[PDB]
Design a protein around this ligand. Structure first.
Ligand code: NAG
Ligand code: NAG
Ligand code: NAG
Ligand code: NAG
Ligand code: NAG
Lengths: 350, 350, 350, 350, 350
């Protein structure tokens, strides 16, 4: 029971998982599409060499014109003195670099803030289960006392007496939360991961703006082979002119990546903003019970605190641990009420 | 028992599962067929270049004419000044976009309304099994009292006394259903998912009506290569005329998608209408027992309510849980009768 | 025990399963063969273009003549003014449509009549095992009474007394069968599924008689390319004449499908006939036992009733459940008899 | 223990399993070899067309001459007016038909005689284990009386008394075997399956004798393309003459299939003959045991009875069930004897 | 414990398994290599046709010359009037035939001598474990008697008395072994399997000596195409002369197979000779314990008896069953001793 609970513990908020998967898979899918196009077309570019050229000579011209992009510029009939067509060649490599960059912050978070968070979460839930049991066991005596005397004054007095009984409030958790309220490691790692994601998105925007808009269309370009030693060969032409077939795929890939990351920006902004605000209905729900009372009194402090991230993970987990299904219904009963404690105790016993 | 039961709980209905599968598989199947045709034909189009052109020059003409669809229009000998043949090139990408759009509402529903619904279903069934056990436990005393006195007046009086005994009616369920009847999150998500499906179907209709009917046949088109820098090349022709071989596949894909989504429309309309009416024979069947009676008196309210969706999921689930295997036969016995309670109690005990 | 039993419950039948498998596998296998032939031949058709045509122009002619089947009708040199050769191109698509049509009634039956039948079978067998145990429990007292007095008059009197004892006859089963005898959902679904199978078989017959017999042989056909915008090109011929290589595969596929469905027709007719008659030796076998006696008195009514389908499934299942291996031997003993009950009781106890 | 025994029960004998496997594997393996040759050669036939013909025209001639086998006869330079070369084209299809035909009787046997045989076998073995236990339980008293009195007269008298005690002889088994001696379903299915196998073997012999010997060698054949519309084409030759490369593979396949089925004939003859004779040493072994004595006295009748098949499967199964390893040694002891019963009882107890 | 022992029983010896694997896999590996060479070379042979021949005509010549090996001889420039080059074509088929022939005796042995041997082995080991336990249980009394009186005369007298006690010597095993001494089925099957292996090895030697040495080198051969109907074709040459590329692979395959089977011959001879001699140190080791004494004194007759095979399998199995690790150490103690019995008894007790 315990071990399976530890394995099922969540250390990555459900919403951020989709962002991780998208930001790490989209460049990979685009790169796979680029490779598929490259291997389907046979040749990345095709050139219009004279009829005299044999098949081998034409293949040599194609290869030398396609491989001379990273090295020398090539100019089409709509451009200035020079235009750089290199991004056509360095597209899959840039996609690999972008995928690695996007995966890097995930690795940073996992290696830097998985173990402490796991330990804190497991310890807190282990304490909280028995804390809830101990809080519940007094409800029977509370109900008997209420039945004996119906006035509310005695009820409030006995509630105060139970609170002061010192049989609970777990001074361990009080000190632990007091210490955590000053810790900043988890918030630091979270904010750093989000900021890295945003910085890399801006970097991709800059890359696709500086190096892809200039040659976005660039239908054809006039290559040359005489730059090498074979300048005394009159057989070859001077300015063999040709084009590149994967231009449409390049344009698509670029636009698709831009759109995907524009979509992803606001999600990351919301994820970062989640820390600025303390986790409000649930707070009023859990304030009543002494077990959750201790951790609900810390909202006076600044929102940016390690406990805040721990609070987010507790809210994410407790939704499925099992301990949440009861107090929610109990507080729904309280809200509906103009008896409730007796019904809650009966349900818990059942 | 509880574990496997909560694993086996269904949260997507049986009928909507087929629609979800179809609306995401059909576009993928059509895309796979398009890619298979592309890689089987070797080239997407073939052009009738002069005999002087070598193999490499002919391949260059083919590639430049096939890649100049998204960029420039091409006109056949039956059209107006201009006709756009770009939908031929952007078919698989549009199919991918449509598949993602159709899959989006499923993800929205699963991320937005799976956990609350799961918790509500689990709590309701867990309480309902105990409610049924407690209710059936009193049939023995009912039988003894009925045997002692045969008149129906005493039977009715004792039935009222049992109802007022207060040993059941579970004030938890009463207040839970009262709260649910005002909630609108589940109905909102359901209606939003259905409306998204309808809107995306209409969008596909518009896309295939605007950008496929104009060039539905468009056998051939007249391409040109002189638009580039090689406008001084007298060797090449001026208006190389050629065609595209995947026209039949394009026409099929379009018609097939239109037919599939026309088929799917009415199913989604029925799914949306399901909420407009409360789930009648089963209602009369389950009204008798006190356990199901409590949720059977909420029919007065507006049909649109969170409880209605939960009612649908309970009806879908109880049909296989096991709890329904008895009351149906008991109410069949009641219908047959001009003793029945005794037979039902004996069957339950057995 | 109960779990594995309900997993092993059969809800299709041993015979109709083979028809279900064949009616879907045959079109799929034929389509796979057609695709294999298409990808092995490389070119679905080959045309006899002049020697002047280069390789690219010849490939263009092949593609344009093969793609102009579904759009225009081509004329062979043995025919009337015009003949339609489109079924050659639309063969695998028609096979896919036929496979989907064949699979549709199976899905209808599974989604429409699997759950009610499963529940009815489960309840009936669960009650019948206990009924058999209770019935056999009295054989000991019957044996003692028979041993005490050897005359047959007292034996018959005690048999009547046991029948009237009211310790069995399970009024639940009586009313359940009475209600079922009026139900018609299961018979309706069964008849609808079989009728859909027959209608689709007739539709395939019509399709292969209208659109395959006319062009069954159609060795060659005279194609044309000047219909496009190369009508002023004197280089091309006027009426390039050519043939299609997969003609034999087409002929085979057609004949094979016709034969397979002709074989399948009588099986479905027999499946429909199975409902018109109640299942006779087994009835005389099971009449004696009181538990089986109740369900054996309902044949006075029309054979077309919901209970009839449930009776068929009971006969199909009980053959392997275990509850049948004994009564068969007991009734074999009864037939062999000119003691038997004592031997049966001893065997059951052992 | 029981369930695993039921699963491990053999229902197809060990010898006929090899014939079943071979009669289906051989045609499938030959078909796979034919397809491998077809896809390795690239062209099923190659033709010697003039040098003027381009590559496309030569491929057209090849395809039209290879596809005109099933349609029109082709004559080689050693034949009469006409010879039919169709069997070259319809070889893999004929192999598929033969494989399906050979698989059909197996399916008939499995669907028609598996369940009754399984039920009879399981019932008989379940009764026989208890019968053997009861029979051996009396060996202790037999040994005691034999020790008390050494004369053989008292031994025989006590043997007769034990036989008449009526504590065994299981009247159930007697009546069951008496009923089975008249049943003919199992022998009918067995003989029908064997006769179907023999008939299909003879059919293959006829097919390979009528349609393969005539054109067994048929090196080359003179094709023609002018039969179509292009009879005014002076360019093409009149009687293009060519050959087929897979002739050796065809010859092999034919000879191999003939040899395999000639090998299989005698095995099936022996399988059929197995029923004509009752299974003798084992009968003398099992006659002594009272449990096996009952079925031993049933060979007075005709060997062709249902029990004969049941006897064959009992002999096949008991060899591994466990109930055979002891009585064989006991009867070996009896044969060696000029004490043995005491040793057998001690071994059984141990 | 028992069942796993039955599954782990060895029924094929450790040495003959390697011979089986080699003799069944070597031809398969050589066939795979031949097929790989065939599919890597593209054309099994290449011919030097004139320059006038187009590509299609050259391919036709290649195919017609390669396919005319099994039909007509081809003569090279070093040979007599005729030489047969067919073995080049039938090499993989001959390898398949050889593999099937080598696998046949294995199947014969497994189908004909696995069940009886398995039953005998399991029965013998089951009896022998109890025999060993019963024999060792008397060592305690033997030790007590030896301690009471130290003289060897009383020790020998008590040993004889224990041997005559009749509490062991298991007349079951005595009679079983006496019967087995006359059985010959197992030795017959073993000798037949070995003789089949030797005969098939000799057959391969004959096949490779008659049909491979004559044309072992045979670099080239002069083919002809005019033998058909194109004898009036002046365009074709008369005696197109060409070679075959897989000659080296053929030579290798042949030499490798010869070497492998020459290696395998002596191993099979040793396996056959194994039966001629009874298995000697172990015989003296087991001559002591009464459990193994019974089977040790059954060696007086001819070594070729059924028990001999049973003895071989017992020796092979007991090495790992567990029942041998003790008596070996006890007899080592006996050999080392000039005390040994006392030490062995103390070790057993410990
Ligand atoms: C074509 O070839 C000739 C001779 O090889 C050469 O003189 C001429 O320059 C070539 N054409 C071009 C455009 O270079
Ligand atoms: C064929 O080639 C010649 C010279 O290479 C050129 O003048 C002519 O225009 C070409 N014909 C076409 C139709 O392009
Ligand atoms: C053959 O080619 C020449 C020149 O390319 C052309 O004039 C003639 O029409 C062609 N033959 C046919 C049958 O079209
Ligand atoms: C070769 O081609 C010429 C012209 O294309 C034709 O007249 C002649 O008949 C052809 N040769 C044969 C054998 O058909
Ligand atoms: C070359 O071809 C011509 C005609 O195409 C033919 O007459 C001659 O015999 C061929 N050469 C040889 C060596 O056969």
């Amino acid at each position: 029971r315990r071990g399976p609970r530890l394995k099922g513990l969540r250390l990555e908020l459900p919403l951020d998982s989709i962002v991780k998967r998208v930001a790490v898979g989209s460049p990979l899918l685009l790169m796979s599409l680029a490779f598929a196009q490259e291997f389907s077309s046979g040749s990345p570019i095709s050139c219009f060499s004279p009829s005299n050229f044999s098949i081998r000579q034409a293949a040599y011209v194609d290869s030398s014109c396609w491989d001379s992009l990273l090295h020398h510029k090539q100019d089409g009939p709509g451009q200035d003195k020079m235009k750089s067509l290199w991004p056509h060649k360095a597209l899959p490599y840039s996609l690999l670099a972008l995928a690695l960059l996007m995966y890097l912050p995930v690795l940073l978070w996992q290696y830097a803030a998985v173990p402490a968070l796991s330990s804190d979460l497991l310890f807190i839930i282990s304490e909280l289960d028995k804390s809830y049991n101990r809080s519940i066991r007094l409800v029977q005596h509370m109900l008997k006392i209420r039945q004996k005397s119906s006035d509310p004054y005695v009820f409030w007095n006995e509630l105060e007496k139970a609170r002061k009984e010192r049989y609970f409030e777990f001074p361990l958790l009080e000190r632990y939360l007091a210490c955590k309220q000053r810790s900043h490691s988890l918030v630091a790692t979270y904010l750093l991961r989000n900021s890295l994601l945003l910085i890399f998105t801006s970097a991709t925007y800059l890359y696709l703006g500086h190096f892809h808009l200039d040659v976005f269309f660039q239908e054809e370009f006039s290559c040359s082979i005489k730059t090498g030693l074979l300048s005394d060969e009159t057989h070859v032409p001077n300015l063999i002119t040709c084009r590149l077939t994967s231009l449409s795929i390049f344009q698509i890939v670029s636009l698709s990546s831009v759109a995907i990351y524009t979509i992803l920006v606001p999600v990351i902004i919301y994820n970062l903003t989640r820390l600025c605000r303390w986790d409000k209905r649930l707070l009023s729900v859990y304030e009543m019970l002494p077990a959750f009372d201790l951790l609900s009194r810390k909202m006076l402090g600044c929102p940016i605190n390690d406990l805040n991230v721990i609070l987010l993970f507790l809210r994410a987990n407790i939704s499925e641990l099992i301990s949440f299904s009861w107090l929610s219904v109990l507080c729904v009963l309280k809200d509906t009420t103009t008896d409730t404690v007796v019904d809650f105790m009966t349900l818990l016993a059942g």
